[PDB]
Design a protein around this motif. Structure first.
Motif, PDB file in Angstrom:
ATOM      1  N   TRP A  69      84.245 -27.718  85.577  1.00  0.00           N
ATOM      2  CA  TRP A  69      83.508 -27.728  86.832  1.00  0.00           C
ATOM      3  C   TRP A  69      83.604 -26.381  87.538  1.00  0.00           C
ATOM      4  CZ3 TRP A  69      85.831 -27.958  91.880  1.00  0.00           C
ATOM      5  CH2 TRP A  69      84.905 -28.120  92.912  1.00  0.00           C
ATOM      6  N   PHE A 111      85.432 -39.043  92.396  1.00  0.00           N
ATOM      7  CA  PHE A 111      84.144 -38.479  92.017  1.00  0.00           C
ATOM      8  C   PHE A 111      83.085 -38.768  93.072  1.00  0.00           C
ATOM      9  CE2 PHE A 111      84.778 -38.145  87.133  1.00  0.00           C
ATOM     10  CZ  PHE A 111      85.679 -37.129  87.358  1.00  0.00           C
ATOM     11  N   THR A 166      88.168 -45.050  78.166  1.00  0.00           N
ATOM     12  CA  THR A 166      89.542 -45.514  78.045  1.00  0.00           C
ATOM     13  C   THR A 166      90.311 -45.365  79.347  1.00  0.00           C
ATOM     14  OG1 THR A 166      90.279 -43.366  77.195  1.00  0.00           O
ATOM     15  CG2 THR A 166      89.600 -45.017  75.599  1.00  0.00           C
ATOM     16  N   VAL A 167      89.732 -44.692  80.333  1.00  0.00           N
ATOM     17  CA  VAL A 167      90.280 -44.617  81.678  1.00  0.00           C
ATOM     18  C   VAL A 167      89.428 -45.402  82.663  1.00  0.00           C
ATOM     19  CG1 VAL A 167      91.033 -43.094  83.514  1.00  0.00           C
ATOM     20  CG2 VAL A 167      91.289 -42.405  81.158  1.00  0.00           C
ATOM     21  N   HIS A 195      83.914 -28.707 109.856  1.00  0.00           N
ATOM     22  CA  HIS A 195      83.098 -27.622 109.327  1.00  0.00           C
ATOM     23  C   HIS A 195      81.693 -27.636 109.904  1.00  0.00           C
ATOM     24  CE1 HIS A 195      86.300 -26.920 106.445  1.00  0.00           C
ATOM     25  NE2 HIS A 195      85.696 -25.786 106.164  1.00  0.00           N
ATOM     26  N   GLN A 229      80.672 -34.288  98.883  1.00  0.00           N
ATOM     27  CA  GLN A 229      80.825 -32.854  99.096  1.00  0.00           C
ATOM     28  C   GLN A 229      79.627 -32.091  98.553  1.00  0.00           C
ATOM     29  OE1 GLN A 229      82.792 -30.484 100.408  1.00  0.00           O
ATOM     30  NE2 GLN A 229      81.648 -28.861  99.388  1.00  0.00           N
ATOM     31  N   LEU A 254      80.608 -24.281 111.771  1.00  0.00           N
ATOM     32  CA  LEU A 254      79.424 -23.593 111.281  1.00  0.00           C
ATOM     33  C   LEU A 254      78.297 -23.601 112.298  1.00  0.00           C
ATOM     34  CD1 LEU A 254      79.385 -24.962 107.631  1.00  0.00           C
ATOM     35  CD2 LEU A 254      79.978 -22.663 108.330  1.00  0.00           C
ATOM     36  N   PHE A 265      96.928 -37.471  80.587  1.00  0.00           N
ATOM     37  CA  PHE A 265      95.816 -37.530  81.518  1.00  0.00           C
ATOM     38  C   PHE A 265      95.623 -36.197  82.212  1.00  0.00           C
ATOM     39  CE2 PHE A 265      92.657 -39.328  84.097  1.00  0.00           C
ATOM     40  CZ  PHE A 265      92.739 -38.627  85.273  1.00  0.00           C
ATOM     41  N   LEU A 300      83.565 -36.194  95.594  1.00  0.00           N
ATOM     42  CA  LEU A 300      82.979 -34.946  95.117  1.00  0.00           C
ATOM     43  C   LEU A 300      81.461 -34.963  95.244  1.00  0.00           C
ATOM     44  CD1 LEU A 300      84.997 -33.760  91.984  1.00  0.00           C
ATOM     45  CD2 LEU A 300      85.106 -32.962  94.342  1.00  0.00           C
ATOM     46  N   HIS A 338      84.847 -31.700  73.455  1.00  0.00           N
ATOM     47  CA  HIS A 338      84.486 -32.929  74.132  1.00  0.00           C
ATOM     48  C   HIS A 338      83.161 -33.611  73.823  1.00  0.00           C
ATOM     49  CE1 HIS A 338      86.958 -35.266  76.807  1.00  0.00           C
ATOM     50  NE2 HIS A 338      85.865 -36.003  76.842  1.00  0.00           N
ATOM     51  N   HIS A 397      93.541 -33.893  80.259  1.00  0.00           N
ATOM     52  CA  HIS A 397      92.112 -34.187  80.396  1.00  0.00           C
ATOM     53  C   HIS A 397      91.567 -33.769  81.765  1.00  0.00           C
ATOM     54  CE1 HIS A 397      91.497 -36.205  76.594  1.00  0.00           C
ATOM     55  NE2 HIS A 397      92.629 -36.856  76.775  1.00  0.00           N
ATOM     56  N   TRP A 398      92.355 -33.975  82.815  1.00  0.00           N
ATOM     57  CA  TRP A 398      91.911 -33.662  84.166  1.00  0.00           C
ATOM     58  C   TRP A 398      91.751 -32.165  84.355  1.00  0.00           C
ATOM     59  CZ3 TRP A 398      90.268 -36.895  87.921  1.00  0.00           C
ATOM     60  CH2 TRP A 398      90.089 -36.351  89.190  1.00  0.00           C
ATOM     61  N   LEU A 457      76.644 -32.551 100.855  1.00  0.00           N
ATOM     62  CA  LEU A 457      76.758 -31.860 102.137  1.00  0.00           C
ATOM     63  C   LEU A 457      76.592 -30.354 101.974  1.00  0.00           C
ATOM     64  CD1 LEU A 457      79.654 -34.009 103.492  1.00  0.00           C
ATOM     65  CD2 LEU A 457      77.641 -33.573 104.838  1.00  0.00           C
ATOM     66  N   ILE A 458      77.250 -29.771 100.972  1.00  0.00           N
ATOM     67  CA  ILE A 458      77.082 -28.345 100.734  1.00  0.00           C
ATOM     68  C   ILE A 458      75.645 -28.044 100.335  1.00  0.00           C
ATOM     69  CG2 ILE A 458      77.875 -28.430  98.333  1.00  0.00           C
ATOM     70  CD1 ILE A 458      78.268 -25.579 100.845  1.00  0.00           C
ATOM     71  N   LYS A 476      85.592 -41.516  75.395  1.00  0.00           N
ATOM     72  CA  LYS A 476      87.010 -41.575  75.668  1.00  0.00           C
ATOM     73  C   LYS A 476      87.275 -41.672  77.155  1.00  0.00           C
ATOM     74  CE  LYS A 476      90.336 -39.502  72.493  1.00  0.00           C
ATOM     75  NZ  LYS A 476      90.463 -38.324  71.599  1.00  0.00           N
ATOM     76  N   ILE A 477      86.303 -41.263  77.971  1.00  0.00           N
ATOM     77  CA  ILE A 477      86.362 -41.518  79.402  1.00  0.00           C
ATOM     78  C   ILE A 477      86.439 -43.015  79.669  1.00  0.00           C
ATOM     79  CG2 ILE A 477      83.857 -41.575  79.756  1.00  0.00           C
ATOM     80  CD1 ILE A 477      86.495 -40.025  82.053  1.00  0.00           C
TER      81      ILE A 477
HETATM   82  C1  LIG Z   1      80.321 -29.435 102.807  1.00  0.00           C
HETATM   83  O1  LIG Z   1      79.991 -28.090 103.121  1.00  0.00           O
HETATM   84  C2  LIG Z   1      79.985 -27.663 104.458  1.00  0.00           C
HETATM   85  C3  LIG Z   1      80.629 -28.659 105.404  1.00  0.00           C
HETATM   86  C4  LIG Z   1      78.542 -27.420 104.836  1.00  0.00           C
HETATM   87  C5  LIG Z   1      80.775 -26.356 104.383  1.00  0.00           C
HETATM   88  C6  LIG Z   1      82.255 -26.499 104.032  1.00  0.00           C
HETATM   89  C7  LIG Z   1      82.581 -26.756 102.586  1.00  0.00           C
HETATM   90  O2  LIG Z   1      81.759 -26.567 101.707  1.00  0.00           O
HETATM   91  C8  LIG Z   1      83.952 -27.232 102.261  1.00  0.00           C
HETATM   92  C9  LIG Z   1      84.898 -27.391 103.408  1.00  0.00           C
HETATM   93  C10 LIG Z   1      84.269 -27.507 101.024  1.00  0.00           C
HETATM   94  C11 LIG Z   1      85.508 -27.986 100.539  1.00  0.00           C
HETATM   95  C12 LIG Z   1      85.696 -28.242  99.252  1.00  0.00           C
HETATM   96  C13 LIG Z   1      86.889 -28.747  98.606  1.00  0.00           C
HETATM   97  C14 LIG Z   1      88.119 -28.954  99.442  1.00  0.00           C
HETATM   98  C15 LIG Z   1      86.816 -29.059  97.293  1.00  0.00           C
HETATM   99  C16 LIG Z   1      87.804 -29.655  96.471  1.00  0.00           C
HETATM  100  C17 LIG Z   1      87.516 -29.892  95.193  1.00  0.00           C
HETATM  101  C18 LIG Z   1      88.334 -30.498  94.165  1.00  0.00           C
HETATM  102  C19 LIG Z   1      89.760 -30.841  94.490  1.00  0.00           C
HETATM  103  C20 LIG Z   1      87.745 -30.783  92.983  1.00  0.00           C
HETATM  104  C21 LIG Z   1      88.286 -31.462  91.876  1.00  0.00           C
HETATM  105  C22 LIG Z   1      87.550 -31.689  90.778  1.00  0.00           C
HETATM  106  C23 LIG Z   1      88.004 -32.375  89.633  1.00  0.00           C
HETATM  107  C24 LIG Z   1      87.299 -32.647  88.512  1.00  0.00           C
HETATM  108  C25 LIG Z   1      85.870 -32.227  88.329  1.00  0.00           C
HETATM  109  C26 LIG Z   1      87.923 -33.397  87.445  1.00  0.00           C
HETATM  110  C27 LIG Z   1      87.300 -33.937  86.403  1.00  0.00           C
HETATM  111  C28 LIG Z   1      87.939 -34.661  85.368  1.00  0.00           C
HETATM  112  C29 LIG Z   1      87.350 -35.253  84.307  1.00  0.00           C
HETATM  113  C30 LIG Z   1      85.863 -35.252  84.101  1.00  0.00           C
HETATM  114  C31 LIG Z   1      88.163 -35.923  83.318  1.00  0.00           C
HETATM  115  C32 LIG Z   1      87.621 -36.745  82.430  1.00  0.00           C
HETATM  116  C33 LIG Z   1      88.156 -37.273  81.170  1.00  0.00           C
HETATM  117  C34 LIG Z   1      87.382 -37.170  80.010  1.00  0.00           C
HETATM  118  C35 LIG Z   1      87.812 -37.724  78.824  1.00  0.00           C
HETATM  119  C36 LIG Z   1      89.028 -38.390  78.738  1.00  0.00           C
HETATM  120  C37 LIG Z   1      89.483 -38.951  77.421  1.00  0.00           C
HETATM  121  C38 LIG Z   1      89.824 -38.506  79.884  1.00  0.00           C
HETATM  122  C39 LIG Z   1      91.143 -39.231  79.791  1.00  0.00           C
HETATM  123  C40 LIG Z   1      89.400 -37.953  81.101  1.00  0.00           C
HETATM  124  C41 LIG Z   1      90.267 -38.103  82.324  1.00  0.00           C
END
Ligand SMILES: COC(C)(C)CCC(=O)/C(C)=C/C=C/C(C)=C/C=C/C(C)=C/C=C/C=C(C)/C=C/C=C(C)/C=C/c1ccc(C)c(C)c1C
Ligand code: BCL
Ligand code: BCL
Ligand code: BCL
Ligand SMILES: COC(C)(C)CCC(=O)/C(C)=C/C=C/C(C)=C/C=C/C(C)=C/C=C/C=C(C)/C=C/C=C(C)/C=C/c1ccc(C)c(C)c1C
Ligand SMILES: COC(C)(C)CCC(=O)/C(C)=C/C=C/C(C)=C/C=C/C(C)=C/C=C/C=C(C)/C=C/C=C(C)/C=C/c1ccc(C)c(C)c1C
Ligand SMILES: COC(C)(C)CCC(=O)/C(C)=C/C=C/C(C)=C/C=C/C(C)=C/C=C/C=C(C)/C=C/C=C(C)/C=C/c1ccc(C)c(C)c1C
Ligand SMILES: COC(C)(C)CCC(=O)/C(C)=C/C=C/C(C)=C/C=C/C(C)=C/C=C/C=C(C)/C=C/C=C(C)/C=C/c1ccc(C)c(C)c1C
Ligand SMILES: COC(C)(C)CCC(=O)/C(C)=C/C=C/C(C)=C/C=C/C(C)=C/C=C/C=C(C)/C=C/C=C(C)/C=C/c1ccc(C)c(C)c1C
Ligand SMILES: COC(C)(C)CCC(=O)/C(C)=C/C=C/C(C)=C/C=C/C(C)=C/C=C/C=C(C)/C=C/C=C(C)/C=C/c1ccc(C)c(C)c1C
Ligand SMILES: COC(C)(C)CCC(=O)/C(C)=C/C=C/C(C)=C/C=C/C(C)=C/C=C/C=C(C)/C=C/C=C(C)\C=C\c1ccc(C)c(C)c1C
Ligand SMILES: COC(C)(C)CCC(=O)/C(C)=C/C=C/C(C)=C/C=C/C(C)=C/C=C/C=C(C)/C=C/C=C(C)\C=C\c1ccc(C)c(C)c1C
Ligand SMILES: COC(C)(C)CCC(=O)/C(C)=C/C=C/C(C)=C/C=C/C(C)=C/C=C/C=C(C)/C=C/C=C(C)\C=C\c1ccc(C)c(C)c1C
Lengths: 44, 69, 44, 69, 44, 69, 69, 44, 69, 44, 69, 44, 69, 44
Positions: free
Chosen positions: A26, F37, I25-26, B48, F43, B52, A15, F40, I16, A18-19, F46-47, I22-23
């Motif tokens: 992104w 998600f 499957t989760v 924030h 977020q 801001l 996993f 996200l 992908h 994939h993550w 808001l941004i 496959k998504i």
């Molecule tokens: C608001 O703004 C203000 C207030 C105006 C200004 C302030 C502001 O801006 C601020 C403070 C911002 C803060 C932002 C922060 C902290 C962001 C943190 C972001 C994170 C941790 C992102 C993680 C993303 C993670 C991602 C995309 C993951 C995607 C995974 C995917 C698709 C997996 C699929 C899949 C596909 C196929 C198969 C077969 C399998 C098994 C899987 C699992």
């Protein structure tokens, strides 16, 4: 050993592959759009 | 540390900085802690918005300054 | 003895190690960003 | 204490400051109390918005005062 | 006798000890911060 | 990396960039990650509200410019 | 009391001030009533926003009056 | 007879005693605070 | 497509656009996808608030134009 | 092999067919409405 | 009543004012109806915000009128 | 025949009696308060 | 109808106006549809806020017109 | 064949009959109220 999520270590590692794919896709697309936005207007 | 607590009865002593880890005998982190992270995200967004809105922070007065592209 | 969370004491202690790691990482990064923000502008 | 209650029927006496701890025979804290902490967080945010809006509190008028860096 | 929360009376009393600890810690810290805020500015 | 952590006791070493994937032994992604998600998405909204409020971005001042239809 | 009800069919009589306690045969308070308390908290916050916005209530015009410290 | 909440009639009646206690305590305290607020300012 | 990913280890290849499906499957769509549709509804409402606030769109300036009844 | 969603691979592929249908219908209708809106007013 | 319905196929007749009570064969009120009451509370709050904003209703212009204490 | 809510038809009808009681009580009280509000001020 | 769909593979034909009812093989209405009704309530509230803000609709300009009591 | 919702095809079709009834009732009443609102004021 009966992990709290109910996932085995192998399931967890698969996993995470994939993550990481999702996270990096992104991140890269966001970076591209940021470069384009900065070219248009720097915001500082 | 053992702080004085307002009608504790003293069979169970608390001593807590050491007796953390014990909250996880009530709170199952597999069901919580994504909700708690959502709480932290809400806190992040609110602090924030506040910061801001304060003069000088963020980009409300700096959109075009220098080094443009 | 059948804890309310369904975790054993050993599971609870191991998790707390991980949780303390997360808490301290978050605290230290926030402290760094605060120092930088204060240098930029003190806000009091 | 036993306060008078509006159509109680008196088989079960309440006496409550002593008979707290008994709420936890209905409310399972493993499923609640992270939600209750979220309620407390919302209360915290709302009282802070209010207090920070009051004149003199917070940092809306003090962003650059002294001892700068 | 099969309590609605699924907790025994002993579990309930032990938890209430912990809960009272949390409540009183929160109350005392809030009282301190209130005294400090009032010293700074009374708000009435 | 192994960063110094504020009252860690050193039986379990962390070394985390390598020991990610291990969060998924606590967080079951079948029950979370649609909620994450949603976080996200919040977020993102808001941004976007913030950025669109900044001068020059978005379409608040450009509704009729050129090449119309 | 038995109030007239709009297409009741009269096999089950209601008589309700006496036949409260019967709602708890549908609503399990171990799963609800923390959510209901959250509803009550939201009501509390909304009525407070309203009342504090009314002239004279709260502390919007009284931050520094007397007996200071 | 297998009530929808999973509570027996006896459990329901006992709980309702506790609930009425809570409701009336809340009502009486709110009434006191209302009388005090009205004395301070009637709002109509 | 196989994009380069920041500390992937290459036992599992992604590829992908083909390895969607496959998504599911989760993500179990019987438990999600009404929540995801709610997310889409929120997105719809927010983009509509924004667009309707833009000059010329919606009905804020056109309530009585012509062909009345 | 005991997928995390509880779906088999065949179930997942069939569902994805339905999901792609939904996604593409939504995309095409949105594209039509966008073309109409742009004709009415370009927004840039 | 049996209203005409847009591509009904007529094996199951609806006749609904009589065939209410049948919604409760899909909606379990032990799991819903506290959520539905929360919906009703939200409706109550929104209609009250609206009505109190209308001129003459509520207490925005009547805080000190007469019969004071 | 294994209804989706898990209620039997008899349970559903009994509950609907209670629900109709609640609905009509709410409707009648709201109607009274509306008549009083209209007397105070018609709002159209 | 069978609309063309962007990388469908044609083992399963869709033909959907006829193959509705099949969504209920994924969405269990006993667990959803009160949430969906809540979504509909939110939509109702938002479209009402918008419409009531439009000139002439609602009661913002008509509180005292005629036929009073 | 063990549908994801836990409904059989027959259950799904019967429910869809009820759902179509609800949808069409809502649509028709909304259409009536829209016609009345447009008569009162067209909004374009
Ligand atoms: C608001 O703004 C203000 C207030 C105006 C200004 C302030 C502001 O801006 C601020 C403070 C911002 C803060 C932002 C922060 C902290 C962001 C943190 C972001 C994170 C941790 C992102 C993680 C993303 C993670 C991602 C995309 C993951 C995607 C995974 C995917 C698709 C997996 C699929 C899949 C596909 C196929 C198969 C077969 C399998 C098994 C899987 C699992
Ligand atoms: C507008 C003029 C006044 C004002 C006028 C009023 C009026 C009028 C009333 C209150 C009431 C309340 N006010 Mg006020 N109040 C003001 C400013 C404040 C400030 C502040 C920061 O300045 C605070 C902290 C509060 C705090 C409070 C709450 C303690 C209380 C509502 C609790 C409730 O309903 O719980 C609802 C119950 C729950 C959500 C579930 C249980 C939650 C926990 C256990 C509650 C603990 C405390 C509570 C009193 C216990 C009740 C007993 C029951 C057994 C639970 N007020 C301003 C200055 N306030 C109201 C009240 O109900 O008092 C009882 C009330 O009637
Ligand atoms: C704008 C002019 C008026 C105004 C005009 C109106 C009008 C008009 C109406 C109300 C109604 C209500 N008003 Mg108002 N009201 C005003 C100011 C107030 C103030 C205040 C702080 O000033 C308060 C506390 C209230 C309070 C209330 C509520 C008691 C009630 C809505 C409850 C409801 O629908 O529950 C919905 C039910 C639920 C959410 C589930 C059950 C929750 C609990 C059990 C409800 C208990 C009380 C309730 C009356 C019981 C109904 C019986 C059923 C068996 C549950 N109004 C202003 C001054 N008010 C409305 C109403 O419906 O009255 C019945 C209504 O029609
Ligand atoms: C802006 C000009 C007009 C206005 C113009 C319109 C227009 C235009 C429309 C409405 C519609 C509605 N209006 Mg309006 N309306 C105004 C002011 C009001 C006021 C008020 C306080 O003044 C109220 C109480 C309402 C109330 C309502 C609702 C009854 C209804 C939306 C319900 C819905 O979609 O449920 C969605 C369904 C659900 C959330 C699930 C079921 C919930 C319960 C069972 C609904 C019961 C009542 C409902 C009519 C039943 C439909 C049958 C189905 C079988 C469920 N309007 C102003 C004055 N109103 C809309 C409508 O859809 O009417 C049908 C609509 O088209
Ligand atoms: C809003 O502002 C206003 C209103 C404008 C102004 C007011 C204002 O500002 C206010 C009032 C602010 C109040 C703030 C408060 C109270 C903050 C409380 C914060 C807390 C308690 C943070 C806890 C963080 C905790 C953290 C990060 C923990 C992280 C843990 C992690 C990652 C573990 C993973 C892992 C990794 C690997 C493995 C293998 C395992 C098992 C685990 C578990
Ligand atoms: C909004 O403001 C306005 C609107 C502007 C103005 C109005 C306004 O302000 C208002 C109205 C405010 C109303 C406020 C009210 C009602 C507040 C009620 C507060 C309560 C009930 C707090 C309870 C706290 C309870 C607490 C902290 C309990 C903590 C417990 C803890 C940590 C136990 C752990 C543990 C630890 C270790 C172990 C081993 C175990 C087992 C446990 C359990
Ligand atoms: C928003 O305002 C506007 C919009 C500006 C203006 C409009 C406005 O204002 C409006 C419309 C307001 C409407 C208000 C309404 C409808 C309020 C309804 C309130 C109700 C139903 C309260 C019920 C409380 C019920 C309570 C406290 C019950 C407490 C029970 C408790 C603690 C039992 C414990 C226990 C303890 C020990 C043991 C051993 C056991 C077993 C138990 C159970
Ligand atoms: C907010 O704006 C601002 C802030 C002002 C400005 C900013 C702004 O705008 C932004 C940032 C916007 C961002 C937007 C983004 C990221 C959008 C992402 C959209 C996605 C991923 C949509 C997916 C849709 C997916 C869809 C419709 C899928 C539908 C599937 C359906 C019906 C299947 C049924 C079925 C039917 C029958 C049968 C038998 C079966 C089995 C099934 C399954
Ligand atoms: C927002 O406004 C704007 C936006 C400004 C303006 C627009 C606006 O205003 C709009 C659009 C408003 C729309 C309003 C709508 C659609 C309202 C729909 C209301 C409904 C469906 C109410 C149902 C109530 C149903 C009720 C009370 C039922 C109560 C049942 C009860 C207590 C049973 C207990 C019991 C008791 C004892 C026992 C033993 C048992 C078994 C039971 C079950
Ligand atoms: C916000 O506005 C802005 C932002 C200002 C402007 C923009 C704006 O406006 C926008 C964008 C609006 C978008 C609107 C959209 C997309 C609406 C989609 C609506 C849908 C899909 C409605 C479905 C209704 C479906 C309904 C009623 C179904 C009801 C079914 C019922 C009762 C079955 C019971 C029953 C009864 C008895 C029995 C025995 C059984 C078994 C059942 C099941
Ligand atoms: C679970 O984890 C999450 C939530 C998921 C996230 C992680 C998380 O929880 C984290 C990171 C937590 C950090 C927690 C911290 C930092 C907690 C810090 C706690 C502290 C500093 C407590 C202090 C208490 C002090 C007392 C009690 C003093 C009393 C004094 C007097 C004078 C008492 C007086 C008194 C006593 C008795 C009587 C009878 C009377 C009359 C009086 C007056
Ligand atoms: C789970 O997944 C989701 C949530 C579902 C989504 C995906 C997700 O999680 C993603 C994408 C995550 C990305 C995570 C990243 C990027 C994480 C990055 C973490 C980093 C950079 C941590 C750094 C820590 C640094 C420390 C700790 C330094 C300490 C320094 C001193 C000087 C410490 C001092 C000190 C120490 C001890 C004592 C005793 C004392 C007194 C002191 C002062
Ligand atoms: C689940 O379904 C729901 C959520 C329920 C709803 C339906 C849903 O999900 C839908 C409809 C989804 C649509 C998804 C789409 C449209 C997804 C589109 C994804 C795309 C376009 C990904 C592109 C990735 C590109 C990369 C990764 C490029 C990297 C480049 C460099 C240059 C990388 C650099 C680099 C790499 C490695 C290293 C070590 C270093 C140093 C660097 C710099």
């Amino acid at each position: 050993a009966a992990n709290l999520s109910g996932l085995t270590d192998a399931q967890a590692k698969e996993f995470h592959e994939h993550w990481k794919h999702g996270v990096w896709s992104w991140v890269m697309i966001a970076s591209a759009v940021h470069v384009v936005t900065w070219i248009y207007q720097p915001w500082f | 540390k053992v702080p004085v607590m307002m009608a504790d009865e003293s069979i169970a002593t608390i001593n807590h900085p050491e007796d953390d880890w014990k909250i996880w005998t009530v709170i199952n982190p597999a069901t919580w802690m994504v909700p708690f992270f959502g709480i932290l995200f809400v806190q992040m967004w609110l602090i924030h918005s506040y910061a801001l809105s304060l003069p000088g922070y963020g980009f409300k007065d700096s959109v075009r300054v220098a080094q443009p592209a």
